[PDB]
């Protein structure tokens, strides 16, 4: 059946170019169009462009015309997209789709997309491996449950996914809420852990946080105070 | 050319799902749309404004006339959850155009609105010349939320990251967002903001360097 092979995940610094590519079986890679469609986190597809692999013609986007280049090479039906000058909202997935719908009208002499590769995901970051910094989130009642606080750690600018938090060495479970890590425009992660405790605890029972970095070998023990 | 889509749709279980795509004079244009069912890849479901590629449930129709396609699911079930795009071909510029997508959500609960939690700087992160207010988003349910930051009055836009949701051990979902800043500006202000809209209602928490 016909299947779009793509390459797999990059990440690069900013102001670098990277080569993904795209290799078609199923079919015969000249009998059509090859387009490229990305989607950054969370947002829409967006086309970049397609190449005709018989004629090597292609067709940019206004947007990536000029700082991005589509290639292809026939002997091993394979296409290429290279960007070029990459900086944070290059961050995506890119993904490749053949231009197997014909046309059915000459007024309308375009061939649409049917079947998709599954897409090659680019990171724009510093790259290095790098440990957290981790700050106190105070205790506050304002948005709890009556009688009841909250308080966390910020566990910021680490590279890469995961970092681990525990509270208490583990002997704190109830209440814990680790929100899932944002990857950051600087290509660094960072994310929240918070736990709900009651009120009356605060003047008496201590709290901290165990954060873990495996990749960076760090480890903090935070003390979260009123 | 702009193609304009709703950003989500609720529908219950068996009921009709219709999404719209517009466009001026895209009644000409033959319309096509696209499937993207959470993270698997897009598939097409409706070609040509009414055809249904081999494979796709005839559930699944497709309409287009004068300035607005669109896209009808009768009866729909759990399985159609997906996030549905239509495009079309621009002669006048060559463009393929893809529209914003629309996320469909199939009801299997209540509607639940989100809880907000707004933390500001610590003294420490202040200490070591940065700045984050962190904003913290629970239990909402669908999990489709938008997230505006405010400086005194005034939109911020610079330096917000915010995740997409993730559903939580109570089948609600919970977000994330982020606005970093220098001291200084943080020092600077009155107060700044996050702002949450879930379905069209709002809630929003306000800290102060004071």
């Known amino acids: 059946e016909v299947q779009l092979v793509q390459s797999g995940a990059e990440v690069k610094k900013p102001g670098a170019s990277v080569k993904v590519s795209c290799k078609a079986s199923?079919?015969?890679?000249?009998?059509?169009?090859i387009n490229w469609v990305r989607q950054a986190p969370g947002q829409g597809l967006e086309w970049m462009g397609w190449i005709h692999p018989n004629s090597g013609d292609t067709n940019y986007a206004q947007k990536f015309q000029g700082w991005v280049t589509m290639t292809r090479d026939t002997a091993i039906s394979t296409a290429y997209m290279e960007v070029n000058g990459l900086k944070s909202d290059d961050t995506a997935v890119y993904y490749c789709?053949?231009?197997?719908?014909?046309?059915?009208?000459?007024?309308?002499?375009?061939?649409?997309?049917?079947?998709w590769g599954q897409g090659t995901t680019v990171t724009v970051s510093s790259a290095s491996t790098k440990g957290p910094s981790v700050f106190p989130l105070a205790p506050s009642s304002k948005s709890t449950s009556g009688g009841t606080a909250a308080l966390g750690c910020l566990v910021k600018d680490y590279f890469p996914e995961p970092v681990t938090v525990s509270w208490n060495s583990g002997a704190l479970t109830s209440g814990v809420h680790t929100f899932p890590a944002v990857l950051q425009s600087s290509g660094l992660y960072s994310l929240s852990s918070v736990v709900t405790v009651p009120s009356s605890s605060l003047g008496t029972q201590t709290y901290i946080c165990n954060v873990n970095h495996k990749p960076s070998n760090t480890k903090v023990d935070k003390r979260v105070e009123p | 050319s702009v193609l304009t889509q709703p950003p989500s749709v609720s529908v219950a279980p068996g009921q009709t799902a219709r999404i719209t795509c517009g466009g001026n004079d895209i009644g000409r244009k033959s319309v096509h749309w696209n499937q993207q069912k959470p993270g698997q890849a897009p598939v097409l479901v409706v070609c040509?404004?009414?055809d249904r590629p081999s494979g796709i449930p005839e559930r699944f129709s497709g309409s287009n006339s004068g300035n607005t396609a669109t896209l009808t699911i009768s009866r729909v079930e759990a399985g159609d959850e997906a996030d549905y795009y239509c495009q079309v071909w621009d002669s006048s510029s060559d463009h393929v155009i893809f529209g914003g997508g629309t996320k469909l959500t199939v009801l299997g609960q209540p509607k639940a609105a989100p809880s907000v939690t707004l933390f500001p700087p610590s003294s420490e992160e202040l200490q070591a010349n940065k700045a984050t207010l962190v904003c913290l988003i629970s239990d909402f349910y669908p999990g489709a939320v938008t997230v505006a930051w405010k400086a005194d009055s005034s939109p911020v836009k610079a330096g917000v990251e915010t995740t997409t949701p993730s559903k939580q051990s109570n089948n609600k979902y919970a977000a994330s967002s982020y606005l970093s800043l220098t001291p200084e500006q943080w020092k600077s202000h009155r107060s700044y903001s996050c702002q949450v809209t879930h379905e069209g209602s709002t809630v929003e928490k306000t800290v102060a360097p004071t």
């Open positions: 199923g079919y015969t890679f000249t009998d059509y169009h």
């Open positions: 040509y404004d009414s």
């Open positions: 789709a053949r231009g197997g719908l014909e046309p059915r009208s000459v007024d309308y002499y375009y061939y649409g997309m049917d079947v």
